Amino acid sequence: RSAEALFEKAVTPSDVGKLNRLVIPKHHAEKHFPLPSSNVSVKGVLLNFEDVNGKVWRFRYSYWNSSQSYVLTKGWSRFVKEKNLRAGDVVSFSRSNGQDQQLYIGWKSRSGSDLDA
Questions:
Q1: How large is the greatest C-alpha to C-alpha distance in the chain, in angstroms?
Q2: Residue 65: Cβ-neighbour burial (10 angstroms; 0-12, 13-18, 19+)
Q3: DSSP-assigned letters across all residues of 65-105
Q4: Which of 16, 21, 106, 114 has the fewest CB atoms within 10 Å distance of its CB?
């Protein structure tokens, strides 16, 4: 079946700036995104986001900004370049209740008119 939108956030100029790294808040990555009860020591976590355009993407979960700030490194560059993503757009993430912890990445580009693509 289809997935369900977890949280929709806007991409800041920093997300697609020099760093070119994705960032995710804790207020949303705490109630929606759980924690691994097996691999906990020093390393981080991995993610697998699908693409509506018949494509696959894998991001790397890390601990940035003080600590509680979860950033998504690796994959962002290849993604932002593929879809030519930039600042001003909206980044949303969903989750499927299938058998595995599969996720999906969906973006949005508000133009204004309804006829606009």
A1: 51
A2: exposed
A3: TTTTEEEEESSHHHHHHHTT--TT-EEEEEE--SSS--EEE
A4: 114
4 Ramachandran zone, left/alpha/beta (phi>0; psi -120 to 50): beta
SS3 label, residue 41: coil
Q: Which CATH number fits domain 1-117: 2.30.30.30, 3.40.50.300, 3.30.420.130, 2.40.330.10?
A: 2.40.330.10
Distance of alpha carbon 99 from its chain centroid, rounded? 20
Which amino acid is present at 25?
P
Which letter does DSSP use for residue 111 in this model? -
Q: Collapsing DSSP states into helix, strand and coil, what is residue 75?
A: coil
Method used to solve the structure: NMR
Rounded CA separation 109/94 (Å): 17
